């Protein structure tokens, strides 16, 4: 979800944009500002919450040794989903 | 490899060697760029038992240097080591 | 049999190695007699020089003398005898059997600091 | 301790200990320590007034014959009052051995040049002048060898900073390469890496 | 296990010696050919 | 020499500065099929020395 | 004679690029005119042989 | 493992540029000899020390 | 176990002396050298037709840096700064914060490609395979600061080259 | 408190050596201006040599002034021989460096440093 400042400048996924009175916009004059349009905070929120039937799940990000270190997530809160601190995939105990 | 036998004989004669036997350009004799996945072996410390690290700790068996002389008979004169053995001339190809 | 070259560049062949070695060893013992008896350089160098001189007096051959002196060619054994002679002539001047000139400072050789 | 630990050599350890006793009692006027490390390397710590009598001994004595000066080195240690530690690495081809002769100086006391023993030293200690500021007496042509021609200071001292004090750039007003005080667009990031747990109990120092 | 290993009988023998294979006529023959060329030219 | 830089690039990923031999061994094992190509290089390299 | 096969391979390199127009096209763009098996073509027009 | 490979050491005789040239050529020869022996005698196993 | 290069006395019979003088006067070894050079004249050269042909590379190749994502679009980097701790040239500059969903992500990820020594210690220090040194080597610029990459350029190199970086890591992860 | 000398037994031999080094530099300055085709005057270079000598005029240790004579002779040998270029000679004249603030108020204006 990229947006645009009043100066016409794209705001990055970090939130950086130069101010109106900031001289450092002159580096983009006649050139471009390279932002990445694939925001990971948007793409991870599109994922479905995975319903599992255990009390503690494991997550390695998929792909085995191609993902992240394997972590175990406790799913005892029925208020909040159990979110992987590495990959951001989130889990819910189905009962 | 695609050279005609006239140019091949000319080239072999001008070099004086059989050049087609040992071509410095490479063809289908080299390895495939796509290989099957390997199963690499593990070391000797991948054991589930009798593998306490205190019994294979290299860095902790390093000692401080043993002080021989410090300023706090008819004994034999020594060398740092026995004198080096004279090398043998090569039986393969001595050039003699 | 007159070995044609020593194999080393700038090291000429000695025509009469035994007489040259006897002269150099007796000259080392002569210079080395000027050192005091308590000095370990005198005792150690007299020991090795008397051993080498006994071996030179015991062997007529050049090749077997090279194999039992155990110093390579006979010409670099002669070179080593000359270096030992020059060293002992310097050791007369230096007098290193004397006690230590100065103790080092208190943690001068302490590693790690 | 078989596969992953380095195999200890006891024979060369014993031989280097005996030869260190030999060197120490032939030359007790200068020899201050003799030590053999666990990986079997002999160090002869001597007094700086005996650089030449020791090194001419080990080069010329018929039980030493250290005919090659492999490397000559200084080490700055600022916690010592003699902050420089001059290190001679010697190679005896006859007995197939190596020895280390270590001595010391501070900023002001000269060391006698060993070019009359090993001509190989002619640049090394010259490098030690350029990098550490250890003056060598009776050196044939003592000058800088590695730094720039107008370079002030001696870089391999540990109170000298990693980047220098001056940087160079071409100035177009003066048509010339000029020196200015160094200003980095990004400072070198000093990392504090040392763990606060002791790694090696064998090397523990006694407390105060 | 699967590891980069040589073949079972090992690799073939690899040549490593000098091969400067001594071609050409003798010195007598080369001077004779040169003299014969001179004699043909002179004639 | 270009083929030997291909050997460095296959073993480490850099043609010159491999950072491959490390304290404790090497960084990474040989890729499969590398030693066959080292054989095919070495079998023919003698003729290259001979013509030099 | 094996020179006739060389000239015939050159003439079928001419005939293999789709005539003289394709031959001179690949000669001036590529500075090479040898023919290969078309392995594929991407969505940009790069042709792989 | 140089104590386990078999190779010769080329020795000059005159100490000039030409003997050093021939020594480097014959060291390339003996390097091909060592590479043949290393390709024939490559053991299996790990490539780092297993002290982690 | 040693050999003597150049320890040959030439033979002194009239045959060998005449051979050496015919070599001297008739230039036999010079014609040998001309013949070896003429033998290379009639060889197919080693020249590849760059840029239409490319030099062969391996999947271990260390080229242009890129930041990878998971197969959900979430970026792999969790701001742990191991790559910039291991970096031998101090080419990596990382700043982080918890972002709006509490995830541990970077706000700054700079790689100076003019300090970088292209040794790949960052990709092998990375615990999540986030920073990788990809297959691209054709990224020469006309300006110095176009090689001063920030996080946007690195995530765009990941999005640009992921179809190839995933296959190189597929072919080489079992050696790692 | 008893140390080994470098060249000088006391300060007087050291001042003899400092004096002879200043003599040698004073003689060399016109040759240095001529062959490096410097655009300073000879008087300006002799003033710079005077400044580089009088910077060190507070040193009361014979060993330190022995080392200063040694380093000055090394600079002189690198100048007599064309080992320095024009740039290494002109680095004594900090031309591209803007004059720093010297008083308190302007250093207060420009930044944080004393
Ligand atoms: C000598 C005069 C030239 C005679 C032709 C010649 O020697 O051809 C090389 C021909 C093949 O040489 P090769 O080194 O074995 O090359 C093998 C390749 O596979 C053969 O090459 P290829 O398989 O890659 O075939 C493609 C090649 C085919 O090559 C040719 O058509 C050769 C060019 C012929 C002219 O065609 C091209 O690359 C197009 C080249 C077009 C321009 C050639 C230059 C023209 C110069 C005159 C104007 O040589 C011989 O057959 C032996 C010498 C013949 C001497 C003839 C009597 C004198
Ligand atoms: C073109 C420019 C090139 C610049 C040349 C750079 C060479 C500079 C070499 C520096 C050498 C020195 O500064 S050694 C001087 C240190 N002397 C002392 O600490 C003792 C005090 N000495 C002096 O005051 C000297 O003026 C005298 C003449 C020895 C004594 O004067 P006082 O008595 O009244
Ligand atoms: S390849 Fe090496 S130098 Fe470059 S960023 Fe990675 S760790 Fe740093
Ligand atoms: S790229 Fe990898 S090593 Fe670097 S901070 Fe991110 S997760 Fe850590
Ligand atoms: Zn996960």
mmCIF file of C-alpha atoms and ligand atoms in Angstrom, chain B residues 2-8 11, chain G residues 1-11 13 23 33-34, chain I residues 42-43, ligand 1:
data_model
loop_
_atom_site.group_PDB
_atom_site.id
_atom_site.type_symbol
_atom_site.label_atom_id
_atom_site.label_comp_id
_atom_site.label_asym_id
_atom_site.label_seq_id
_atom_site.Cartn_x
_atom_site.Cartn_y
_atom_site.Cartn_z
ATOM 1 C CA UNK B 2 35.626 -29.141 -35.967
ATOM 2 C CA UNK B 3 38.783 -28.654 -38.006
ATOM 3 C CA UNK B 4 39.311 -30.495 -41.279
ATOM 4 C CA UNK B 5 41.876 -33.282 -41.473
ATOM 5 C CA UNK B 6 44.078 -31.170 -43.757
ATOM 6 C CA UNK B 7 44.241 -28.355 -41.186
ATOM 7 C CA UNK B 8 44.465 -30.989 -38.439
ATOM 8 C CA UNK B 11 48.530 -28.105 -37.210
ATOM 9 C CA UNK G 1 37.838 -33.183 -50.697
ATOM 10 C CA UNK G 2 36.838 -31.819 -47.293
ATOM 11 C CA UNK G 3 36.957 -28.161 -48.391
ATOM 12 C CA UNK G 4 33.696 -28.675 -50.294
ATOM 13 C CA UNK G 5 31.993 -29.625 -47.024
ATOM 14 C CA UNK G 6 33.331 -26.393 -45.502
ATOM 15 C CA UNK G 7 31.919 -24.263 -48.312
ATOM 16 C CA UNK G 8 28.625 -26.176 -48.149
ATOM 17 C CA UNK G 9 28.408 -25.591 -44.391
ATOM 18 C CA UNK G 10 28.977 -21.888 -45.047
ATOM 19 C CA UNK G 11 26.273 -21.810 -47.716
ATOM 20 C CA UNK G 13 24.705 -21.099 -42.690
ATOM 21 C CA UNK G 23 22.412 -13.652 -42.615
ATOM 22 C CA UNK G 33 26.641 -16.272 -38.171
ATOM 23 C CA UNK G 34 26.690 -19.861 -36.954
ATOM 24 C CA UNK I 42 45.147 -22.827 -37.406
ATOM 25 C CA UNK I 43 43.361 -23.513 -34.113
HETATM 26 C C1 LIG K 1 43.561 -20.628 -48.744
HETATM 27 C C2 LIG K 1 42.452 -19.772 -49.332
HETATM 28 C C3 LIG K 1 41.098 -19.982 -48.670
HETATM 29 C C4 LIG K 1 40.409 -21.275 -49.053
HETATM 30 C C5 LIG K 1 39.268 -21.641 -48.114
HETATM 31 C C6 LIG K 1 39.731 -22.313 -46.853
HETATM 32 O O1 LIG K 1 40.876 -22.559 -46.592
HETATM 33 O O2 LIG K 1 38.705 -22.618 -46.056
HETATM 34 C C7 LIG K 1 39.004 -23.166 -44.750
HETATM 35 C C8 LIG K 1 39.034 -24.669 -44.809
HETATM 36 C C9 LIG K 1 38.580 -25.294 -43.520
HETATM 37 O O3 LIG K 1 39.464 -24.908 -42.452
HETATM 38 P P1 LIG K 1 39.382 -25.449 -40.976
HETATM 39 O O4 LIG K 1 40.423 -24.732 -40.173
HETATM 40 O O5 LIG K 1 39.514 -26.910 -40.917
HETATM 41 O O6 LIG K 1 37.957 -24.982 -40.409
HETATM 42 C C10 LIG K 1 37.027 -26.009 -40.022
HETATM 43 C C11 LIG K 1 35.679 -25.391 -39.765
HETATM 44 O O7 LIG K 1 34.830 -26.405 -39.228
HETATM 45 C C12 LIG K 1 35.034 -24.820 -41.002
HETATM 46 O O8 LIG K 1 34.244 -23.667 -40.642
HETATM 47 P P2 LIG K 1 32.671 -23.790 -40.285
HETATM 48 O O9 LIG K 1 32.366 -25.269 -40.121
HETATM 49 O O10 LIG K 1 32.343 -22.963 -39.109
HETATM 50 O O11 LIG K 1 31.828 -23.304 -41.584
HETATM 51 C C13 LIG K 1 31.333 -21.952 -41.676
HETATM 52 C C14 LIG K 1 32.327 -21.172 -42.482
HETATM 53 C C15 LIG K 1 32.828 -21.981 -43.641
HETATM 54 O O12 LIG K 1 34.151 -21.515 -43.985
HETATM 55 C C16 LIG K 1 34.340 -21.084 -45.229
HETATM 56 O O13 LIG K 1 33.466 -21.012 -46.050
HETATM 57 C C17 LIG K 1 35.773 -20.711 -45.456
HETATM 58 C C18 LIG K 1 35.952 -19.432 -46.260
HETATM 59 C C19 LIG K 1 36.094 -19.679 -47.746
HETATM 60 C C20 LIG K 1 36.556 -18.460 -48.527
HETATM 61 O O14 LIG K 1 31.719 -19.979 -43.064
HETATM 62 C C21 LIG K 1 31.885 -18.813 -42.427
HETATM 63 O O15 LIG K 1 32.227 -18.719 -41.281
HETATM 64 C C22 LIG K 1 31.628 -17.655 -43.345
HETATM 65 C C23 LIG K 1 32.907 -16.916 -43.714
HETATM 66 C C24 LIG K 1 32.719 -15.900 -44.830
HETATM 67 C C25 LIG K 1 33.974 -15.099 -45.160
HETATM 68 C C26 LIG K 1 35.219 -15.955 -45.275
HETATM 69 C C27 LIG K 1 36.466 -15.222 -45.734
HETATM 70 C C28 LIG K 1 36.506 -14.906 -47.218
HETATM 71 C C29 LIG K 1 37.877 -14.467 -47.694
HETATM 72 C C30 LIG K 1 37.951 -14.088 -49.164
HETATM 73 C C31 LIG K 1 37.234 -12.793 -49.506
HETATM 74 O O16 LIG K 1 40.416 -25.078 -45.044
HETATM 75 C C32 LIG K 1 40.625 -26.219 -45.714
HETATM 76 O O17 LIG K 1 39.745 -26.917 -46.138
HETATM 77 C C33 LIG K 1 42.087 -26.509 -45.856
HETATM 78 C C34 LIG K 1 42.847 -25.465 -46.663
HETATM 79 C C35 LIG K 1 42.336 -25.326 -48.083
HETATM 80 C C36 LIG K 1 43.338 -24.693 -49.032
HETATM 81 C C37 LIG K 1 42.846 -24.601 -50.465
HETATM 82 C C38 LIG K 1 43.953 -24.407 -51.491
HETATM 83 C C39 LIG K 1 44.824 -23.187 -51.248
#
